[PDB]
Amino acid sequence: AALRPLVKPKIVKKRTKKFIRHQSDRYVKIKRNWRKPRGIDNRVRRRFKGQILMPNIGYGSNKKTKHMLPSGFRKFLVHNVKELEVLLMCNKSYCAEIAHNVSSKNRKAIVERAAQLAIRVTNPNARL
Amino acid sequence: GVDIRHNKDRKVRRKEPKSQDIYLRLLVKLYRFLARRTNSTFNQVVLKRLFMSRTNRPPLSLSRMIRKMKLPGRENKTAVVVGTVTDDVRVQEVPKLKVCALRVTSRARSRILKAGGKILTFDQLALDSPKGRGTVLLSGPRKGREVYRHFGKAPGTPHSHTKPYVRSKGRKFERARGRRASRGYKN
Amino acid sequence: PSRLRKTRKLRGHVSHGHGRIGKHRKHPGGRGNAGGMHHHRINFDKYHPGYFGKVGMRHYHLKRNQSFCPTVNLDKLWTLVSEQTRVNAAKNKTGAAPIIDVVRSGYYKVLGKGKLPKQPVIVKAKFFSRRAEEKIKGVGGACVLVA
Amino acid sequence: AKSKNHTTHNQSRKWHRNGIKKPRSQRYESLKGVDPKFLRNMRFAKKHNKKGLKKMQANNAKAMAARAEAIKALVVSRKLHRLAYIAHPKLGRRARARIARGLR
Amino acid sequence: APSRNGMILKPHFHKDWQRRVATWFNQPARKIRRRKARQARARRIAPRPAAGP
Amino acid sequence: KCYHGKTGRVYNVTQHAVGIVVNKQVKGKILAKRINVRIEHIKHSKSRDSFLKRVKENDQKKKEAKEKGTWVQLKRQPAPPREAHFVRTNGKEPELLEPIPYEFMA
RNA sequence: CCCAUACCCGGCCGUCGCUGGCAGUCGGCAGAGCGAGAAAGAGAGGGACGCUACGCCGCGACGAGUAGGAGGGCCGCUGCGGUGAGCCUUGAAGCCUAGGGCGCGGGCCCGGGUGGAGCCGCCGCAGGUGCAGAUCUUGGUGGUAGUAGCAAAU
RNA sequence: GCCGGGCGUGGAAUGCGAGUGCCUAGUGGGCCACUUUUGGUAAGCAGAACUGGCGCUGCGGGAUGAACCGAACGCCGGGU
Numbered sequence: 001a002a003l004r005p006l007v008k009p010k011i012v013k014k015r016t017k018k019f020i021r022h023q024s025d026r027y028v029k030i031k032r033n034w035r036k037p038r039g040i041d042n043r044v045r046r047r048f049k050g051q052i053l054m055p056n057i058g059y060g061s062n063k064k065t066k067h068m069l070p071s072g073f074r075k076f077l078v079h080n081v082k083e084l085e086v087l088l089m090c091n092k093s094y095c096a097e098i099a100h101n102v103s104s105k106n107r108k109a110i111v112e113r114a115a116q117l118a119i120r121v122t123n124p125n126a127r128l
Numbered sequence: 129g130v131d132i133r134h135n136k137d138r139k140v141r142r143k144e145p146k147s148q149d150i151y152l153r154l155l156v157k158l159y160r161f162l163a164r165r166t167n168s169t170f171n172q173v174v175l176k177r178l179f180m181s182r183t184n185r186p187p188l189s190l191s192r193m194i195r196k197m198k199l200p201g202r203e204n205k206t207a208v209v210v211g212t213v214t215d216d217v218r219v220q221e222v223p224k225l226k227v228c229a230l231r232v233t234s235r236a237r238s239r240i241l242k243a244g245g246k247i248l249t250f251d252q253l254a255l256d257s258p259k260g261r262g263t264v265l266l267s268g269p270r271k272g273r274e275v276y277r278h279f280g281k282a283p284g285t286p287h288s289h290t291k292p293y294v295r296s297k298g299r300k301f302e303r304a305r306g307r308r309a310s311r312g313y314k315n
Numbered sequence: 316p317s318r319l320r321k322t323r324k325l326r327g328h329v330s331h332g333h334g335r336i337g338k339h340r341k342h343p344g345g346r347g348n349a350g351g352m353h354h355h356r357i358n359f360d361k362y363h364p365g366y367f368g369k370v371g372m373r374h375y376h377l378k379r380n381q382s383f384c385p386t387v388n389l390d391k392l393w394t395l396v397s398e399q400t401r402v403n404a405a406k407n408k409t410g411a412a413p414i415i416d417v418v419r420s421g422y423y424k425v426l427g428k429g430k431l432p433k434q435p436v437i438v439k440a441k442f443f444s445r446r447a448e449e450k451i452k453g454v455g456g457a458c459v460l461v462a
Numbered sequence: 463a464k465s466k467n468h469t470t471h472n473q474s475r476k477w478h479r480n481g482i483k484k485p486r487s488q489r490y491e492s493l494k495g496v497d498p499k500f501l502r503n504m505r506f507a508k509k510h511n512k513k514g515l516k517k518m519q520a521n522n523a524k525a526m527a528a529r530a531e532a533i534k535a536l537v538v539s540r541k542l543h544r545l546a547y548i549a550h551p552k553l554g555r556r557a558r559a560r561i562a563r564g565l566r
Numbered sequence: 567a568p569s570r571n572g573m574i575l576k577p578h579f580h581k582d583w584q585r586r587v588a589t590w591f592n593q594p595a596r597k598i599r600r601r602k603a604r605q606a607r608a609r610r611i612a613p614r615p616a617a618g619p
Numbered sequence: 620k621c622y623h624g625k626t627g628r629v630y631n632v633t634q635h636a637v638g639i640v641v642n643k644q645v646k647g648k649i650l651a652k653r654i655n656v657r658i659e660h661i662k663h664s665k666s667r668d669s670f671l672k673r674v675k676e677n678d679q680k681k682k683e684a685k686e687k688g689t690w691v692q693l694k695r696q697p698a699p700p701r702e703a704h705f706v707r708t709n710g711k712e713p714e715l716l717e718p719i720p721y722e723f724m725a
Numbered sequence: 726c727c728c729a730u731a732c733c734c735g736g737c738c739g740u741c742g743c744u745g746g747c748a749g750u751c752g753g754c755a756g757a758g759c760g761a762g763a764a765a766g767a768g769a770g771g772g773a774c775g776c777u778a779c780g781c782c783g784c785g786a787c788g789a790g791u792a793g794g795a796g797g798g799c800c801g802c803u804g805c806g807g808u809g810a811g812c813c814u815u816g817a818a819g820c821c822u823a824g825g826g827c828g829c830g831g832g833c834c835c836g837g838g839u840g841g842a843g844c845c846g847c848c849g850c851a852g853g854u855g856c857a858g859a860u861c862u863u864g865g866u867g868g869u870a871g872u873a874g875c876a877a878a879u
Numbered sequence: 880g881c882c883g884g885g886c887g888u889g890g891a892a893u894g895c896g897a898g899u900g901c902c903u904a905g906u907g908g909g910c911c912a913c914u915u916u917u918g919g920u921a922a923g924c925a926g927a928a929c930u931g932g933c934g935c936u937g938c939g940g941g942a943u944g945a946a947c948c949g950a951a952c953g954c955c956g957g958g959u
Binding site: 278282293294295 | 571572575576
């Protein structure tokens with residue numbers, strides 16, 4: 001009963017786990033965000049066996065399915081009802097996403113307008 | 129494992145002008161079309177010369193193109209120069225000219241047009257001659273800048289007539305030891 | 316624009332673009348133009364020949380206004396007068412030659428650097444060269460001196 | 463605290479990176495260092511080369527026409543060879559019109 | 567520590583110059599002070615000319 | 620001593636000497652430097668005339684055989700593999716060879 | 726017979742090259758081609774998509790990397806000029822999160838909770854702009870540890 | 880040394896687009912091996928030549944290992 005996309009291709013990802021910073025587990029000051037090790041003796045840097053993996057461009061997702069949700073759509077942030085009339089001609093490709101700070105009285109104007117324009121919403125059941 | 133060197137496989141050349149001039153960027157849109165759908169190699173040279181930096185398209189003097197158009201098998205063809213045509217005050221008579229340049233100085237317009245000449249722009253050149261038929265593509269003196277007199281072999285070298293960088297010239301600025309045979313040595 | 320400078324791309328890299336072995340110390344070679352006759356000897360011979368020593372006579376109280384003599388070539392000689400003057404002479408049939416007052420334009424000495432259009436002039440200058448006098452005479456003009 | 467004194471180890475490798483370029487050959491190499499007395503004469507022979515201008519134009523021209531009289535006094539098998547003639551665009555048109563009637 | 571081919575420079579900064587740097591933010595306000603007393607000068611001697619003798 | 624063996628070309632001839640333009644390799648670059656040498660340390664190099672001889676026949680065989688209408692080879696081709704041929708072994712039989720035993724010669 | 730990140734085959738990413746291709750979306754003022762081994766002429770007497778040309782598309786080949794160099798950041802931080810008839814007490818910033826996701830990555834967008842008043846996107850401009858280290862500075866808190874210890878002078 | 884005119888079967892094989900100019904960082908402690916080699920009884924010692932390595936480099940093998948043998952690396956599936 002959903003608003004199915006144009007075509008639903010088999011998404012295939014080269015890697016699904018995140019990349020963790022080196023020694024980000026052993027410390028709390030070392031946050032999880034990736035930082036390339038530049039040390040002169042660093043194992044991770046010189047690609048030793050059985051270490052953390054360094055992100056290359058070889059892990060790049062297919063351009064046919066890049067920035068594509070599991071539902072076969074692509075997100076687009078929306079702030080008001082006027083920023084929806086843009087997406088009325090990309091119905092089968094680009095879904096709509098209401099921004100966070102949009103109040104609850106304005107969200108129940110966007111969603112049914114997006115039901116009129118047949119645009120899919122990824123966060124319809126909001127604060128409500 | 130392939131035994132090659134990737135040292136110089138990325139060819140260093142301009143593929144679009146660094147300038148953000150939209151009138152210049154509109155001309156390139158016009159000549160990108162003419163370069164690839166006409167077999168005329170004239171448009172490929174003009175396309176390559178539109179990309180270049182100002183130091184690579186030096187100004188053409190007015191007397192230089194007079195000197196190059198009074199050559200025999202000419203005087204019906206059109207003058208095409210990608211740089212700019214400055215007026216030369218040291219020439220008196222001006223023949224009638226058919227000029228196409230990117231920019232013409234205000235005095236060089238009034239002196240050309242008073243001689244019954246004709247000044248064209250590159251959009252009008254393509255309309256009058258798409259394949260570049262009957263034109264003479266010219267260029268100003270490229271190594272005429274003051275900078276090249278410092279280049280070459282270094283000064284203080286045997287037979288290396290190269291201008292050094294001095295803060296001021298005078299009798300006591302680089303006239304001593306390296307230059308006089310009386311002071312040590314000279315080259 | 317600090318956002319275009321290089322240091323934005325050096326954040327994270329340890330030595331900040333100055334090498335680990337040869338660190339960025341205060342002054343490795345000395346301050347200023349030091350070591351001219353010494354450890355920087357090759358740089359001063361290869362790029363500033365003649366830097367060291369004295370030549371010539373020490374003139375004490377040099378007053379630049381005395382040695383003031385801005386030259387003008389014969390190529391751009393007619394540019395000192397209007398185009399109306401240049402045409403009204405080749406059109407004139409009495410042989411009336413215009414006078415070009417060089418000193419009025421700002422120059423003092425006349426040097427002959429090129430060709431002249433063949434119509435006489437009487438250049439009211441202060442100094443002349445030999446070749447400059449030849450060109451004006453050979454065209455059919457005159458060289459009058461003034462102080 | 464002694465150290466190494468001299469070694470030509472990495473050098474041969476370093477030279478062949480940008481190649482060992484042979485010196486740039488060019489016709490008309492410079493006439494520098496040639497002995498003056500011979501050169502001083504050579505500049506005189508070039509100074510007086512206009513002297514024979516009329517002779518030279520009136521020597522090769524009468525030699526230009528003298529060349530125009532020596533000319534004026536004169537002026538794997540046939541099977542694959544055949545199939546190579548039908549298979550030619552610019553000069554096999556008349557040939558393969560015989561096959562076009564073979565269907566007719 | 568000179569590099570390759572450059573120019574031999576002698577900056578005159580070996581003294582302690584950062585104590586006597588005369589900046590010019592007076593300049594826009596200075597002109598107004600000049601002009602507003604140049605008009606008030608002419609107002610005083612109203613029939614006499616503005617440039618003076 | 621760095622030119623003893625090196626070959627160059629003459630560009631200036633004096634009474635008892637010649638000027639030569641010879642190549643000298645100096646640390647990864649070649650320099651075409653001019654040296655003045657007396658005649659006594661000089662020979663006409665024959666590393667060239669055998670090509671000058673080859674130019675004669677190449678100019679000879681191009682003018683000749685042109686009126687014959689034929690096309691004859693001019694370029695030097697390297698030594699090819701030899702062609703298939705026979706070997707007559709008339710009457711006699713190839714002698715059998717045998718490795719000799721060891722005789723300690725000292 | 727076993728297996729390397731080597732070689733072959735196939736996919737995908739990126740870089741490089743072809744200084745590759747595309748303005749021809751030329752429609753009842755129409756007639757749908759320029760893959761063709763061969764220097765040159767389909768010469769005149771009612772119809773999907775596209776082409777932010779700084780866009781799109783097709784082929785090949787290639788991919789290690791400290792010091793160092795450059796390019797791109799729709800990576801991030803703070804302020805300014807513009808702009809979004811932008812968001813906000815029907816809940817902004819900040820913070821928490823076993824929630825749902827995207828990006829190779831820097832990072833980001835949603836859900837929920839808390840909070841109570843301001844904040845952000847885009848095009849430009851500006852910098853005191855991104856931390857793991859410096860026996861770093863200041864603040865705070867652990868392990869040691871309920872341990873040593875609380876024994877000079879009846 | 881000048882002109883002028885005439886001769887292309889491009890005159891060995893193989894491979895590959897070249898030329899050229901600016902501006903320029905880092906570096907200027909190196910170390911190991913086959914072969915050659917000087918001093919030393921010798922040394923994981925000191926000093927050179929040539930080439931390749933290590934440094935700057937993971938991977939398979941030598942149990943282990945800066946350098947040995949194989950082979951150099953985008954992310955994956957199959958085969959070898």
